[PDB]
Amino acid sequence: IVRLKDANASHPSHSAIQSLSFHPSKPLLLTGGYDKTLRIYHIDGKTNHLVTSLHLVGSPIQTCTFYTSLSNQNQQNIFTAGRRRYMHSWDLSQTAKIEKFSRLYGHESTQRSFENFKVAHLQNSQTNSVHGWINILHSTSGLWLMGCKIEGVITDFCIDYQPISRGKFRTILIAVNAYGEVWEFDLNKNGHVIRRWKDQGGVGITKIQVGGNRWLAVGSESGFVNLYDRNNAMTSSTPTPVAALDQLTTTISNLQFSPDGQILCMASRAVKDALRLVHLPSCSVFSNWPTSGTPLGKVTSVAFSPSGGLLAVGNEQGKVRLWKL
Amino acid sequence: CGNFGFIGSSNGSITIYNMQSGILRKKYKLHKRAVTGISLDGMNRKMVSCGLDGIVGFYDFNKSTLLGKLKLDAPITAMVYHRSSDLFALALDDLSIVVIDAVTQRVVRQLWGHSNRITAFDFSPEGRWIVSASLDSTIRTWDLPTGGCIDGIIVDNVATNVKFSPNGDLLATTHVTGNGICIWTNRAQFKTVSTRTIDES
């Protein structure tokens, strides 16, 4: 295995990471910082030099989400959001004109702010959850297209959600956080439920990724990892793992899937030097790496590439580190 | 009586403290997962508990003896207890409501029909009804002498809390939107009604 060169990009303080994402065609690392810094720097394992950054005055930042991966605007536009009731367009054509996305009617001032939004595949749909039903509107027209009435009674501005690897047209999930309930909803017809089923919020309020589906692995706050197939969601509603393993003595604060849905990644942020990789469907732990003998820190964010070979690990000290895998 | 407090940690320990002096009095450890609901009879005799490892713990309050335990098919999220009839209903992960007679130490009732998770449920003061609030916008009255659903209230703002008044008059419901608390009226001047379920969407 190849140990790459250590990273050099760091915050002046000890700070967190808004989002980790990748350019789909080139190796490039996008970074949103909390001081209104929208920077992106080139990575090869040898390079960390800054391509460009963005600091728009009269607009702070609160969350970061990489704008849609395939319509035509993966490589031109990035929509970023702050504490105000609109969000921003960043143009690599660099034009970078602000398109004030305050154009939701009568329901704009109902959330905290634009803090959590998930764009769909072909950008004709964009999903937003409240404490809470979901708005679905265009990222290029500004009109409220529709919105599915996800009723909710324990919805707490649910932390992360995902149009699945079987296509957004097939179904689309809702991870109802603080109990982790799952609501499969169909995009082809607004108003029809695919199915709902219990996922455990007794263990795991932790973030979860969608595999592919092929595997649906979930993590707990106890080092107890579970493997849930997509067709374990059919009746009866309780899931059963084919293998449920302990590898962490402490909390599991991170989860990632590979693009083929056959590699799980997990990490924590309570004790320094702790990160683990999992193979699928062989259920193997990658033992050559990662261990506690590598500098890992208190890991907040982690991401695989669209190729999934590389691996970005952000700490609470400002160092984000990539690895070919 | 207002003398002792019963707390259940995320690791499984349940301690009994004295509310007058704030002292450690007693500690238990049987659950290996988080304790989701603790109660005791009004006679201060038998102490019940429910955990995420499926465990229903039955204790003697006078001694420290394990009186009983029952294992269910689903972990339990909440415990509401009716004191003057010694029954307690339990919201499980299998979308069913397990009402339990405590003296028998036996599972006696279980309710089905809720398509989604229930966050709030409470006993009628006469012990005949349990109106529950679920994520599928269902606020259902449950009649215990028949064991079936007799009423379902379908709303647009689902109630986060349903709470029976001590007198048989009012209902305290807190909702998802709206900082206020909707109070609901049982008519209670008459009824002989027994009519049934699913209606308007």
Next chain:
Amino acid sequence: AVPSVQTFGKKKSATAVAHVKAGKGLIKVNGSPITLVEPEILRFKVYEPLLLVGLDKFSNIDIRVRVTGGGHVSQVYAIRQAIAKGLVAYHQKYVDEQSKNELKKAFTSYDRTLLIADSRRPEPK
């Protein structure tokens, strides 16, 4: 000032005033611990307040008594009344009531008049 209570224990003519004060568990009879008493067989009868409710119970207090009057049987019956009365007097004022209800239940169930002194008043029938 320390938390402290004082009571008494009476046999036929024996007087034994107790001084149940706070501390670490010294329990003395006029200068002397319990295990030296002589009667030496009636040592077990004054062992009894250690025993009927559980042994420990004493790590926060201290005991000192003194006896004037009586006989060697009468002197030991005076103090062992006063120990149990002196014990619950601390639970009367500082500790909660229901603990003391558990003490007196363990006391009264075996009671050899541990909580009441002897008084004799005859009458023809």
Next chain:
Amino acid sequence: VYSDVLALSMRPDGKEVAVSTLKGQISIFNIEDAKQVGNIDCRKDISKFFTTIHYSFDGMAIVAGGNNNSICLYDVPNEVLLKRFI
């Protein structure tokens, strides 16, 4: 042991007997004078009263009354059944 008594209560079997103490404690005992319970003093500010007491006819309860504007309920074990305030 304590307590000049105003209020006395009997069982109609000749075995159980309740005494009101010189305070709000209510103690009950057998014909072999072994004290079963002693009940805590009277609360309810608008000082202590123990004026009337009764052993119920089923033999499973007693009712206690003072003059502090309520009434108290007990069983043969230690506990309070109910407390009804006027």
